[PDB]
Amino acid sequence: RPLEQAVAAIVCTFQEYAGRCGDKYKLCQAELKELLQKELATWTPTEFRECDYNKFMSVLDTNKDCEVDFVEYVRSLACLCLYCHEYFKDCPSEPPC
Amino acid sequence: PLEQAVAAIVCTFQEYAGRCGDKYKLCQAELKELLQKELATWTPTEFRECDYNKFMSVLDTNKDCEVDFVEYVRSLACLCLYCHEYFKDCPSEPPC
């Protein structure tokens, strides 16, 4: 159930931000950035993922399109794990991402 | 809440991926097992039955072991589009 609760919570957060206004199935990059920075504030990159992390977060600043769907939102979460979670420290898999 | 949730998604991946071999990879069979056991209560919505079935069959047919964390999480996302009521009317056909 732990994964059930976790996945339910990831959809909850998406609904919170996407449901603000307009298309309830889409986010702007700015909303996605805000989401990540506020909901995952304590998450910071690991040793060899610092540069990858920064480029990722700058892209969310630069890019200002609003076609971010749920799948892309979740992908961003995955990317943050590869950058900030110690388990993936030595992962020779350069962020997809 | 999101921090706890994302931490838990990694926990589950570690649980399955850490069984043996490459700790950063899963086989499709392991992914299918993971989904079927960890999300047992999740079932498709009205207009997502066919998409759901095709997705779960692909995990049966394909037996490659190149499923990385990103692909694992993508599968979770896909299950949301299929099984979570919020996306019932989502005109976005599973990526997926």
Swiss-Prot record, chain A:
One of its GO terms (cellular component) is plasma membrane. Residues 10-45, 48-83 form the EF-hand domain. Ca(2+) 1 binds at residues 26, 31. The modification Citrulline is found at residue 49. Changing residue 28 to A: Abolishes calcium binding. Disulfide bonds join 28-66, 79-97. One of its GO terms (molecular function) is transition metal ion binding. Zn(2+) binds at residues 81, 84-85, 91. InterPro entries: EF-hand-dom_pair, S-100_dom, S100/CaBP7/8-like_CS, S100_Ca-bd_sub. The keyword Zinc applies. It is found in: Cytoplasm. Skin specific, specifically expressed at the inner endocuticle of hair fibers. Its main location: cytoplasm. The keyword DNA-binding does not apply. More than half of the arginine residues undergo citrullination by PAD1 and PAD2. Arg-49 is specifically citrullinated by PAD3 and promotes tetramerization. CDD domains: S-100 (cd00213). It comes from the Eukaryota. Ca(2+) 2 binds at residues 61, 63, 65, 67, 72. Keywords: Acetylation, Calcium, Citrullination, Cytoplasm, Disulfide bond, Metal-binding, Repeat, Zinc. Changing residue 66 to A: Abolishes calcium binding. Pfam families: S_100. Homodimer and homotetramer for the citrullinated form. Binds both calcium and zinc. May be involved in calcium-dependent cuticle cell differentiation, hair shaft and hair cuticular barrier formation. This is Protein S100-A3. The gene is S100A3.
